[PDB]
Structure formats: C-alpha cells, structure tokens
Amino acid sequence: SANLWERFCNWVTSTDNRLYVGWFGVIMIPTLLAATICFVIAFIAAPPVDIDGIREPVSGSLLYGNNIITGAVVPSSNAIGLHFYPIWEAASLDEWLYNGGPYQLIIFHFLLGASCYMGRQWELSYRLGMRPWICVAYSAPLASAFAVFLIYPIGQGSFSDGMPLGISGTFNFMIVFQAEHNILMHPFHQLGVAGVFGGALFCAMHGSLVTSSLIRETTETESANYGYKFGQEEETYNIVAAHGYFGRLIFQYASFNNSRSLHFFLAAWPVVGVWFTALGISTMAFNLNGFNFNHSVIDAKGNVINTWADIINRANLGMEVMHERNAHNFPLDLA
C-alpha cells in the first residue's frame, strides 16, 4: 500500500470515476442523500404540520389526503421561529413531525449539498484542465434557493415563512409575497423575468439559427442528426451563413459573428438576470419592497385618480386581508 490515506485521496479525486465524487462531494453526497430520503418519506407519509404556530395543522402529504399538485412538505412552526429544531430537540418524533421538524432537516441539508455541488462544479473543471466559471453560472439558481429557503426566513424572523416544498405550497409563497411586498412592482423582479423570458428567447434564437444552418451530410430520409460524429475536428454548422441570415433579419452590426462573444452573451444574460431576481427576494426579506404608487396622480381638487397601480393594490389587499385567517390579533402585519 503506497499509503492508505494517500490512496483514498487519489480515489476520491480520481477523474476515472463514473460520477466524480469530489472533496466537496464527500460532504455533498451524504447531505443530499439525507435531504432526498427525508423528503420522499415526508411528502408521502408525514402528518399535519402547525406551520403558523396557532395549533391549526396543515396536512401536505399524499397519504393524508393530498395529490402531487397540492401535496407539499410544510415549513417548521412559527412558534419555533428561527430556533434550531433538530430531531434530538424533541420529546418524541410525534412532536417533531407536528412542529414541522422535517422541513429544517431538508432545507439545511439541501442548501448545504447544493453549495458543495457548486464547489464540485469547480473541482472537476480543475481536474480536467478546463476553465472554471461554469460553477459561477450555477451560482444564480443556487443563490435563489438560498434566498427563498434561508435569507427570506432569517429576514422575516421565522422559517415558517420560507417557501414550502410543494407545487401549490409554492403558489402560496408567491401570492402572499406579492401582497406583502408588491414584487411585480420591483426592479429586481422585472430584471428577473427579463433574464428568464430573454433566456428562453435567446435559447430559441441560438437553437434555431444553428440547427437551421447545418452543413448537409444526411440523406433525405435519414435523421439530420446523424450528420455529426462525437469527436469531430471541424464545425457542424455554417456560423457564417447563420450570421448572414440573422444579420439581414435585423441589421448586420446587431448580429453576432463571433461564436465566443455569442456564447458569453448566451450565458451572461440569464445568470445576471436571475442574480438580480435572487437579490430581489433577499432584499425584500428586509422589507424594502417594490414601488408604491398608490394615490399618486390626484386631480385639481384633491380627488384620487386611479391608475393601474391602484387596481393592483385592490388585488393585493384581497390577498393580505385573507391570508392566514386566524393568525393575526392586531392591526399592522409586522411579521
């Protein structure tokens, strides 16, 4: 034995593994297995959770009357707030499942692993001699999960205010958010949808332009895909014919001819846009909300002349006035 530990480190770091369990992986792989296994069990058999700390259990598991679309893993109690609630902090599991214990076990392990997943997306790139930064693109979707699962709860003072782990549970997070923060009227969110819409747009743009300008090497009755072999030397499409068409669609200088400048833009746009959307949720986690143009334009006498901004406010009040029915005892919603 060349030295056990020396070998161990050579295996872990080995680039000959089907799946690159890295150094970050050593933390990732266990944390992600705990999160997934706990989730799957929760989502299927977990019992009702008193999310709002007002003894009014919300069942979100299949076996307890839910389906895929409605079902979810409910956030820890509001009675717990930001307190750490590990299994060994409960008199029993029965108490732990009632106070939304699983939620924390899941969010913490996931966020942890999902971070190492980024750390790994660097490591392998290092071990393979390729440039880094790929992990920096993945920093945007991660920074969102963080914003939605940890930053917002820290800011709002409770994990019960974090986004639930489910379809409908997510829609709840949105509808309520909008009511309390008016996100649609916030610059960061708008940049977010710009990045996402734009992304999908450009994704279609590139995708189409390229596939449409492929050099013919296929039969009339043979998949146009076969005209490419894994491990080619030259390109499989006429990037000069591509630019030729797109340059005429709009106008020459408003078109890419440099594949490298194209692909940077292709990556830069969404990542930057999503970065801001993540900063939006993380900023509005401290109650710095969207623009409030309520009763702005008023007439010569003082009457209030409504704008679409006001019609939005009514829709918002409805959400405000109806969310968490029995949870409020006082006039102002400061939590």
Partner: protein, 102 residues
Amino acid sequence: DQKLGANVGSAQGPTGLGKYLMRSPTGEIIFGGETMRFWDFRGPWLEPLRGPNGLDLNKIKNDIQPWQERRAAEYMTHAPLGSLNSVGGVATEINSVNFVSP
C-alpha cells in the same frame, strides 16, 4: 385594551392561544399573536416588564410607565417596512409618510 378593563392574562384569542400573552416552546410567558416568533427580543423599554419567567402579569398589570407606552407607540408606527420609492408602511399603504428605516 387593559385600560378598557380587559384581563390580559386570561384573554383567549380566535385560535384559543392567548390574544395578548402566551407561552414560548420552553415555557416562558411572551407576547401573543404572530409576534410569538420574536420572543427572543430584548430591549430597554421592554425589560422592566420581564420577570424571572418572562413578562410578569403583575408588572404588566400596574407597572407600565407612560414613557414605555409612547415608546411602544413610536416604534410600532416606525417598523422597518417600506417601498423603494420610500413610502413607509405595508405594500398596500397610501402615500403620505415618506420613510424607510435606516
């Protein structure tokens, strides 16, 4: 409400939890409502009301001082809630109070 003749100690809210005062997960007496999540707050104005078990029902019942009532009023009407364009309050509030907590 206490000045209106209500017995804060035994007041039962909609959920049956305690309109004004309830217990934290570890037994301490804290403020009720959604405010149960901030039972870790400590502050000059509020401490003299705290006992060895949390908020003392006797001090709360007759040791509340005026400077505290207006302190509570002040801070209540100056929570760190506001909009980008600096309009203090909830996203559904009306323009008038130009403010956003530092």
